[PDB]
Amino acid sequence: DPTLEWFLSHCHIHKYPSKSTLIHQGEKAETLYYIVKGSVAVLIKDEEGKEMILSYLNQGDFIGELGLFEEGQERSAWVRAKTACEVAEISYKKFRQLIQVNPDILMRLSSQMANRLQITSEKVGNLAFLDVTGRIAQTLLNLAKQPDAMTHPDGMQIKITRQEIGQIVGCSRETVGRILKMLEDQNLISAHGKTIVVYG
Amino acid sequence: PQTDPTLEWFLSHCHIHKYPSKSTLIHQGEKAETLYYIVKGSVAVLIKDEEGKEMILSYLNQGDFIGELGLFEEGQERSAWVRAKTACEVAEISYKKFRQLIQVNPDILMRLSSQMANRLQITSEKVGNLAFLDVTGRIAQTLLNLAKQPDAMTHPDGMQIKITRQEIGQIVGCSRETVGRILKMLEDQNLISAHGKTIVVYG
Ligand SMILES: Nc1ncnc2c1ncn2[C@@H]1O[C@@H]2COP(=O)(O)O[C@H]2[C@H]1O
Ligand SMILES: Nc1ncnc2c1ncn2[C@@H]1O[C@@H]2COP(=O)(O)O[C@H]2[C@H]1O
Ligand SMILES: [Cl-]
Ligand SMILES: [Cl-]
Ligand SMILES: [Cl-]
């Protein structure tokens, strides 16, 4: 589409190796990014440096957009490359100029911010009233009904690790372990290495 | 609370409607064709968990856009209910008309997008608190957050807020009973005072 091509023609595409930290929470924001190729993780941390993934972002996603609208904004989160990444970069100053020329580019960015807000809002509603057990159970049941869940003699099989469960619900890997054992004993799931079976 | 030429130009293209306290501005799931802007008053943005329990996702106040999430893609449905907390005065404009205003002066889209960005930050922090903080910490953080809403009073011991235990539970994501037990504890810890329907957050 011509809007994205026009936008990219004003950007400088950079290549970063896997595990690069592209954005550090707390730093001064003066640049907008757009993923041309690759995937990243958006993360927040607690005092002990524990973690919760807010989102994965991929090809076609803007990153670092939240500091664009007000002066002196700081990065709201960490963004770390999951794979090697090809990322277009443009100063906020230049981007603001592009918006006056053709605001459709700001409509595209804002469309992504709107979706992100709806997704993050839904996660608040889904997790707020539950304790860690409730959150883990809901998480597994939700994954069991997604298209990539596979058929199993015992029910629906999902691919997920104790670590990434903990990253979704914001708890330790050990707590996940204990809760998965409990869910097995209640005859709701079966856990086998890096896969879980939710009983139907 | 602070308008500017861009906003008054925008408002000159809108119709301002009044909404009594408790009335619904927006119903979740309805087709979105209208953008709102609060001239006066406050609203609550509500969503429900998988058991049908209602949460207060955010309050919005004078100067806030509402109903913007449906503007960017066709056939979008409202993501939440929005109901008046006080009597409100709200400017309305069709998405069709607003898209034309954007072409006339994109600064109005910058104003709207700025709020969307702020909301994402705020909501992201809330999702992090759900995990990083215990229930006590979540209630304590909500009390602070509420001590900074415009409707917050001054007090010789700190900031005095007006909110029901029910409402604290809907913001935090816990039961009214839990809130009661935690406010008592915080009171005994000399961090707050609960004078009936009022709470004083010490500073
Ligand atoms: N809830 C979220 N969902 C998706 N992306 C996010 C979320 N919160 C922050 N980000 C992204 O992470 C970036 C961190 O830097 P910025 O705050 O400039 O811009 C932020 C967004 O691009
Ligand atoms: N997390 C949030 N913070 C503040 N306001 C929100 C949030 N989620 C939804 N809203 C508002 O509630 C509105 C419901 O209708 P829309 O989805 O059109 O637009 C939505 C936003 O204006
Ligand atoms: Cl509606
Ligand atoms: Cl807890
Ligand atoms: Cl009360």
Author numbering:
A (entry chain B): 9 to 208
B (entry chain A): 6 to 208
Share the article's original sentences.
Crp is a 23.5-kDa transcriptional regulator that forms a dimer after binding its cAMP ligand. In turn, Crp regulates expression of the type III secretion system and the Pla protease essential for pneumonic plague.
Y. pestis Crp shares 99% sequence homology with Crp from E. coli, with differences located on the C helix at positions 119, 123, and 127. Crp was crystallized as a dimer, and each monomer had cAMP bound to the binding site. The side chain of residue N123 is involved in dimer formation and directly interacts with the side chain of E78 from another chain. V127 in Crp from E. coli is pointed away from dimerization interface, and it is not involved in the cAMP binding, so isoleucine at this position in Y. pestis does not have any impact that contributes to binding of cAMP or to dimer formation. As confirmation of our findings, an electrophoretic mobility shift assay (EMSA) performed in the presence of cAMP indicated that Crp requires cAMP to bind a DNA fragment that corresponds to the pla promoter.
